[PDB]
Amino acid sequence: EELFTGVVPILVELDGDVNGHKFSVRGEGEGDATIGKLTLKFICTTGKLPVPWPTLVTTLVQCFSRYPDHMKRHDFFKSAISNGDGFINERTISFKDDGKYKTRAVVKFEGDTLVNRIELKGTDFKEDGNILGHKLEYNFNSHNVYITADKQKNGIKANFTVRHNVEDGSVQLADHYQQNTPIGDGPVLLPDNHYLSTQTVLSKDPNEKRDHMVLLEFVTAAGIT
């Protein structure tokens, strides 16, 4: 196809509930799948965010990952978007010794804009833990997202552990269980085992007074040759 040949505008909408605390996040930016780069700004439209921004990074469009040419057949994300009318991204994020997030999102184009609509539910968090107690540093480490084809439902699955730096020098782990499935019936390509290498830098908009997160991200596919 040709849907990701240049810079594409992106829109992210997230509605969540963590331990009863409801909230909403709006994301605006653009992506360039050719170099595997994302640049988006996120705002909490309901006031202050009840959880640390970094815990939402993975939830807040892997179709923008850079897949080297020889791995083009393994780019399930792009394939599903152009042959299956987008895809669904479901995850269970388990924070060690704390609560967990369960997320469902639909990723598809709306006009010339790639949209990621998410519903998030957080349960069993310690009101004084690293999440609700905002004890995580404002940064984000580099991770590898291991992808494999689903064994029974024409889709993929991924597993990886995100490492959140705690302000006391410790690290808060977040195990991710990911599942993707195209929204449409059409034939989408299934990949062989491989992973996505990711780098992310978080920052602030000096002129933004609402709770927010400016984000820069580089993702590259690897594991085959």
C-alpha atoms as a printed R data frame, in Angstrom:
    type eleno elety resid chain resno       x       y      z
1   ATOM     1    CA   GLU     A     1   0.000   0.000  0.000
2   ATOM     2    CA   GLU     A     2   1.017   3.668  0.407
3   ATOM     3    CA   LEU     A     3  -0.787   4.763  3.566
4   ATOM     4    CA   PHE     A     4   2.386   5.362  5.577
5   ATOM     5    CA   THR     A     5   4.735   6.747  2.902
6   ATOM     6    CA   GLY     A     6   4.959  10.222  4.433
7   ATOM     7    CA   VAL     A     7   4.206  11.971  7.714
8   ATOM     8    CA   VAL     A     8   0.718  11.032  8.929
9   ATOM     9    CA   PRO     A     9  -1.394  13.067 11.375
10  ATOM    10    CA   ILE     A    10  -2.388  11.144 14.514
11  ATOM    11    CA   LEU     A    11  -5.210  11.410 17.038
12  ATOM    12    CA   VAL     A    12  -5.436   9.607 20.366
13  ATOM    13    CA   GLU     A    13  -8.465   9.499 22.651
14  ATOM    14    CA   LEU     A    14  -8.335   7.674 25.955
15  ATOM    15    CA   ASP     A    15 -11.057   7.329 28.571
16  ATOM    16    CA   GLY     A    16 -10.041   5.579 31.769
17  ATOM    17    CA   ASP     A    17 -11.042   4.502 35.251
18  ATOM    18    CA   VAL     A    18  -8.366   3.495 37.797
19  ATOM    19    CA   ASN     A    19  -9.703   2.485 41.225
20  ATOM    20    CA   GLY     A    20 -12.791   4.613 40.649
21  ATOM    21    CA   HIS     A    21 -10.849   7.698 39.519
22  ATOM    22    CA   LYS     A    22 -12.130   8.550 36.046
23  ATOM    23    CA   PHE     A    23 -10.191  10.629 33.525
24  ATOM    24    CA   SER     A    24  -9.661  11.345 29.837
25  ATOM    25    CA   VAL     A    25  -6.611  11.998 27.672
26  ATOM    26    CA   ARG     A    26  -6.406  13.656 24.245
27  ATOM    27    CA   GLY     A    27  -3.368  13.105 22.031
28  ATOM    28    CA   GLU     A    28  -2.383  15.147 18.981
29  ATOM    29    CA   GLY     A    29   0.626  14.713 16.677
30  ATOM    30    CA   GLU     A    30   2.141  12.896 13.713
31  ATOM    31    CA   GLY     A    31   4.108   9.828 12.704
32  ATOM    32    CA   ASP     A    32   6.626   8.861 10.038
33  ATOM    33    CA   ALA     A    33   6.762   5.094  9.556
34  ATOM    34    CA   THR     A    34   9.674   5.495  7.160
35  ATOM    35    CA   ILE     A    35  12.018   6.444  9.978
36  ATOM    36    CA   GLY     A    36   9.924   4.920 12.755
37  ATOM    37    CA   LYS     A    37   9.300   8.251 14.512
38  ATOM    38    CA   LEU     A    38   6.342   9.577 16.526
39  ATOM    39    CA   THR     A    39   5.785  13.024 17.983
40  ATOM    40    CA   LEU     A    40   2.599  13.628 19.974
41  ATOM    41    CA   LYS     A    41   1.457  15.848 22.816
42  ATOM    42    CA   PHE     A    42  -1.018  14.493 25.372
43  ATOM    43    CA   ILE     A    43  -3.350  16.429 27.632
44  ATOM    44    CA   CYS     A    44  -5.561  15.222 30.453
45  ATOM    45    CA   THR     A    45  -8.887  16.885 29.581
46  ATOM    46    CA   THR     A    46 -10.492  16.113 32.965
47  ATOM    47    CA   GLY     A    47  -8.057  17.903 35.240
48  ATOM    48    CA   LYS     A    48  -5.123  16.235 36.912
49  ATOM    49    CA   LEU     A    49  -4.127  12.747 35.753
50  ATOM    50    CA   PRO     A    50  -4.779  10.253 38.613
51  ATOM    51    CA   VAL     A    51  -1.796   8.094 37.535
52  ATOM    52    CA   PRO     A    52   1.787   8.903 36.398
53  ATOM    53    CA   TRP     A    53   2.076   9.752 32.687
54  ATOM    54    CA   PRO     A    54   4.738   7.060 32.043
55  ATOM    55    CA   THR     A    55   2.293   4.253 32.987
56  ATOM    56    CA   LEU     A    56   0.126   5.266 30.007
57  ATOM    57    CA   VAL     A    57   2.852   5.542 27.346
58  ATOM    58    CA   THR     A    58   2.337   2.046 25.915
59  ATOM    59    CA   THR     A    59  -1.431   2.529 25.848
60  ATOM    60    CA   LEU     A    60  -1.271   5.968 24.183
61  ATOM    61    CA   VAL     A    61   0.063   3.050 17.273
62  ATOM    62    CA   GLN     A    62   2.704   0.483 16.399
63  ATOM    63    CA   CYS     A    63   1.750   0.801 12.733
64  ATOM    64    CA   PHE     A    64   4.339   3.573 12.766
65  ATOM    65    CA   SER     A    65   7.222   1.261 13.596
66  ATOM    66    CA   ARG     A    66   9.926   1.171 10.980
67  ATOM    67    CA   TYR     A    67  10.009  -2.201  9.296
68  ATOM    68    CA   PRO     A    68  13.137  -2.646  7.202
69  ATOM    69    CA   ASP     A    69  12.306  -3.601  3.610
70  ATOM    70    CA   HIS     A    70  13.284  -7.268  3.973
71  ATOM    71    CA   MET     A    71  10.809  -7.569  6.852
72  ATOM    72    CA   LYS     A    72   7.881  -5.965  5.058
73  ATOM    73    CA   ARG     A    73   5.859  -9.180  5.093
74  ATOM    74    CA   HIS     A    74   6.060  -9.226  8.898
75  ATOM    75    CA   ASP     A    75   4.465  -5.799  9.402
76  ATOM    76    CA   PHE     A    76   1.051  -7.063 10.649
77  ATOM    77    CA   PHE     A    77   0.120  -3.568 11.826
78  ATOM    78    CA   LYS     A    78   0.296  -1.901  8.414
79  ATOM    79    CA   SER     A    79  -1.125  -4.983  6.733
80  ATOM    80    CA   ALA     A    80  -4.182  -5.030  8.978
81  ATOM    81    CA   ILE     A    81  -4.766  -1.324  8.546
82  ATOM    82    CA   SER     A    82  -4.873  -1.537  4.760
83  ATOM    83    CA   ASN     A    83  -6.408  -5.001  4.309
84  ATOM    84    CA   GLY     A    84  -8.523  -5.484  7.421
85  ATOM    85    CA   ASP     A    85  -9.796  -1.947  8.080
86  ATOM    86    CA   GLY     A    86  -7.546  -1.282 11.062
87  ATOM    87    CA   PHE     A    87  -6.931  -3.510 14.081
88  ATOM    88    CA   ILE     A    88  -7.757  -4.018 17.744
89  ATOM    89    CA   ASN     A    89  -5.134  -3.695 20.465
90  ATOM    90    CA   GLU     A    90  -6.042  -5.381 23.750
91  ATOM    91    CA   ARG     A    91  -3.659  -5.482 26.697
92  ATOM    92    CA   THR     A    92  -3.346  -6.503 30.343
93  ATOM    93    CA   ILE     A    93  -0.630  -4.518 32.104
94  ATOM    94    CA   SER     A    94   0.303  -6.023 35.451
95  ATOM    95    CA   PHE     A    95   2.366  -3.815 37.744
96  ATOM    96    CA   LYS     A    96   4.394  -5.980 40.137
97  ATOM    97    CA   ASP     A    97   3.040  -5.829 43.679
98  ATOM    98    CA   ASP     A    98   0.277  -3.457 42.599
99  ATOM    99    CA   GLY     A    99  -2.834  -3.164 40.421
100 ATOM   100    CA   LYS     A   100  -3.226  -3.848 36.728
101 ATOM   101    CA   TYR     A   101  -4.614  -2.102 33.643
102 ATOM   102    CA   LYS     A   102  -6.873  -3.819 31.109
103 ATOM   103    CA   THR     A   103  -7.086  -1.939 27.817
104 ATOM   104    CA   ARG     A   104  -8.995  -2.237 24.549
105 ATOM   105    CA   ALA     A   105  -8.381   0.065 21.629
106 ATOM   106    CA   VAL     A   106  -9.361   0.367 18.006
107 ATOM   107    CA   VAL     A   107  -6.674   1.614 15.625
108 ATOM   108    CA   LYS     A   108  -7.786   2.692 12.164
109 ATOM   109    CA   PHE     A   109  -7.822   5.617  9.782
110 ATOM   110    CA   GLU     A   110 -10.462   8.309  9.973
111 ATOM   111    CA   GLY     A   111  -9.939  10.331  6.833
112 ATOM   112    CA   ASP     A   112  -6.247  11.071  6.480
113 ATOM   113    CA   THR     A   113  -5.795  10.740 10.244
114 ATOM   114    CA   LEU     A   114  -4.660   7.599 12.056
115 ATOM   115    CA   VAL     A   115  -6.858   7.312 15.151
116 ATOM   116    CA   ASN     A   116  -6.292   5.266 18.315
117 ATOM   117    CA   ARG     A   117  -9.415   5.144 20.530
118 ATOM   118    CA   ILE     A   118  -8.814   3.521 23.918
119 ATOM   119    CA   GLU     A   119 -10.867   2.322 26.850
120 ATOM   120    CA   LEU     A   120  -8.833   1.630 30.001
121 ATOM   121    CA   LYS     A   121  -9.787  -0.006 33.298
122 ATOM   122    CA   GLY     A   122  -7.408  -0.089 36.252
123 ATOM   123    CA   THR     A   123  -8.121  -2.310 39.230
124 ATOM   124    CA   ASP     A   124  -6.662  -3.170 42.627
125 ATOM   125    CA   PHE     A   125  -4.091  -0.418 42.989
126 ATOM   126    CA   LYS     A   126  -2.530   0.458 46.326
127 ATOM   127    CA   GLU     A   127  -3.602   4.022 47.119
128 ATOM   128    CA   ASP     A   128  -0.043   4.554 48.420
129 ATOM   129    CA   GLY     A   129   1.771   2.473 45.805
130 ATOM   130    CA   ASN     A   130   4.088   3.751 43.080
131 ATOM   131    CA   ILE     A   131   1.177   4.418 40.717
132 ATOM   132    CA   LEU     A   132  -1.574   6.174 42.677
133 ATOM   133    CA   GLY     A   133   1.077   7.705 44.908
134 ATOM   134    CA   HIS     A   134   2.864   9.258 41.908
135 ATOM   135    CA   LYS     A   135   6.328   7.931 42.784
136 ATOM   136    CA   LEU     A   136   7.562   7.247 39.236
137 ATOM   137    CA   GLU     A   137  10.125   9.469 37.541
138 ATOM   138    CA   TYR     A   138   9.136  11.379 34.422
139 ATOM   139    CA   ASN     A   139  11.095   9.325 31.879
140 ATOM   140    CA   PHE     A   140  10.771   6.123 29.878
141 ATOM   141    CA   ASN     A   141  13.304   3.342 29.280
142 ATOM   142    CA   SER     A   142  13.951   1.414 26.052
143 ATOM   143    CA   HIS     A   143  12.234  -1.931 25.543
144 ATOM   144    CA   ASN     A   144  11.897  -4.776 23.072
145 ATOM   145    CA   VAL     A   145   8.407  -5.871 22.104
146 ATOM   146    CA   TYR     A   146   8.454  -9.544 21.157
147 ATOM   147    CA   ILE     A   147   5.856 -10.387 18.553
148 ATOM   148    CA   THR     A   148   4.603 -13.810 17.561
149 ATOM   149    CA   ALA     A   149   1.628 -14.886 15.452
150 ATOM   150    CA   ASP     A   150  -1.492 -15.913 17.363
151 ATOM   151    CA   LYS     A   151  -1.865 -19.702 17.281
152 ATOM   152    CA   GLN     A   152  -5.620 -19.687 16.772
153 ATOM   153    CA   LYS     A   153  -7.138 -16.398 15.645
154 ATOM   154    CA   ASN     A   154  -5.411 -14.700 12.702
155 ATOM   155    CA   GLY     A   155  -3.639 -12.034 14.693
156 ATOM   156    CA   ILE     A   156  -0.535 -11.515 16.775
157 ATOM   157    CA   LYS     A   157   0.485 -11.489 20.412
158 ATOM   158    CA   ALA     A   158   3.294  -9.754 22.203
159 ATOM   159    CA   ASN     A   159   5.026  -9.974 25.546
160 ATOM   160    CA   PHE     A   160   7.400  -7.575 27.217
161 ATOM   161    CA   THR     A   161   8.112  -5.970 30.544
162 ATOM   162    CA   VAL     A   162   8.241  -2.215 30.874
163 ATOM   163    CA   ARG     A   163  10.613  -0.815 33.458
164 ATOM   164    CA   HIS     A   164   9.456   2.326 35.268
165 ATOM   165    CA   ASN     A   165  12.061   4.217 37.237
166 ATOM   166    CA   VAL     A   166  10.911   4.877 40.790
167 ATOM   167    CA   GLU     A   167  12.136   8.125 42.363
168 ATOM   168    CA   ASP     A   168  13.822   6.174 45.166
169 ATOM   169    CA   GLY     A   169  16.194   4.342 42.846
170 ATOM   170    CA   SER     A   170  14.111   1.181 42.609
171 ATOM   171    CA   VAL     A   171  12.288  -0.007 39.505
172 ATOM   172    CA   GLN     A   172   8.577  -0.739 39.063
173 ATOM   173    CA   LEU     A   173   7.901  -3.555 36.594
174 ATOM   174    CA   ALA     A   174   4.892  -3.631 34.278
175 ATOM   175    CA   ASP     A   175   4.336  -6.927 32.517
176 ATOM   176    CA   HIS     A   176   2.469  -6.465 29.251
177 ATOM   177    CA   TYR     A   177   0.196  -9.055 27.616
178 ATOM   178    CA   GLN     A   178  -0.714  -7.886 24.157
179 ATOM   179    CA   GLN     A   179  -3.127  -9.143 21.576
180 ATOM   180    CA   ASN     A   180  -3.915  -7.716 18.138
181 ATOM   181    CA   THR     A   181  -6.589  -8.754 15.644
182 ATOM   182    CA   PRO     A   182  -7.745  -7.021 12.443
183 ATOM   183    CA   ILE     A   183 -11.203  -5.451 12.532
184 ATOM   184    CA   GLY     A   184 -12.179  -6.637  9.053
185 ATOM   185    CA   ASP     A   185 -12.494 -10.015  7.324
186 ATOM   186    CA   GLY     A   186  -9.938  -9.506  4.542
187 ATOM   187    CA   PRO     A   187  -6.582 -11.356  4.318
188 ATOM   188    CA   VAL     A   188  -3.916  -9.811  6.545
189 ATOM   189    CA   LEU     A   189  -0.328 -11.061  6.776
190 ATOM   190    CA   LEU     A   190   0.830 -12.997  9.866
191 ATOM   191    CA   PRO     A   191   4.477 -12.615 10.906
192 ATOM   192    CA   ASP     A   192   7.259 -14.888 12.084
193 ATOM   193    CA   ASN     A   193   8.804 -14.238 15.481
194 ATOM   194    CA   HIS     A   194  10.450 -10.824 15.690
195 ATOM   195    CA   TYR     A   195  10.551  -7.754 17.938
196 ATOM   196    CA   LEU     A   196  10.290  -3.978 18.005
197 ATOM   197    CA   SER     A   197  13.117  -1.972 19.565
198 ATOM   198    CA   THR     A   198  11.801   1.248 21.128
199 ATOM   199    CA   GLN     A   199  13.293   4.489 22.463
200 ATOM   200    CA   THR     A   200  11.256   7.256 24.096
201 ATOM   201    CA   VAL     A   201  11.948  10.702 25.534
202 ATOM   202    CA   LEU     A   202   9.344  12.554 27.562
203 ATOM   203    CA   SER     A   203   9.221  16.296 28.076
204 ATOM   204    CA   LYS     A   204   7.075  19.268 28.955
205 ATOM   205    CA   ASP     A   205   5.585  22.147 27.010
206 ATOM   206    CA   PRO     A   206   6.738  25.266 28.914
207 ATOM   207    CA   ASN     A   207   3.576  27.097 27.773
208 ATOM   208    CA   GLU     A   208   1.057  24.366 28.714
209 ATOM   209    CA   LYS     A   209  -0.641  24.740 32.100
210 ATOM   210    CA   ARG     A   210  -2.852  21.654 31.969
211 ATOM   211    CA   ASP     A   211  -1.530  18.220 32.978
212 ATOM   212    CA   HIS     A   212   0.280  16.965 29.885
213 ATOM   213    CA   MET     A   213   3.023  14.940 28.242
214 ATOM   214    CA   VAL     A   214   5.030  15.747 25.141
215 ATOM   215    CA   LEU     A   215   6.458  12.583 23.588
216 ATOM   216    CA   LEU     A   216   9.096  11.633 21.040
217 ATOM   217    CA   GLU     A   217   9.425   7.975 20.058
218 ATOM   218    CA   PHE     A   218  11.599   5.865 17.748
219 ATOM   219    CA   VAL     A   219  10.572   2.283 16.941
220 ATOM   220    CA   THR     A   220  12.392  -0.180 14.694
221 ATOM   221    CA   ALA     A   221  11.574  -3.807 13.785
222 ATOM   222    CA   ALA     A   222  14.341  -6.430 14.059
223 ATOM   223    CA   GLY     A   223  14.993 -10.116 14.612
224 ATOM   224    CA   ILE     A   224  15.161 -11.413 11.030
225 ATOM   225    CA   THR     A   225  17.656 -11.414  8.104
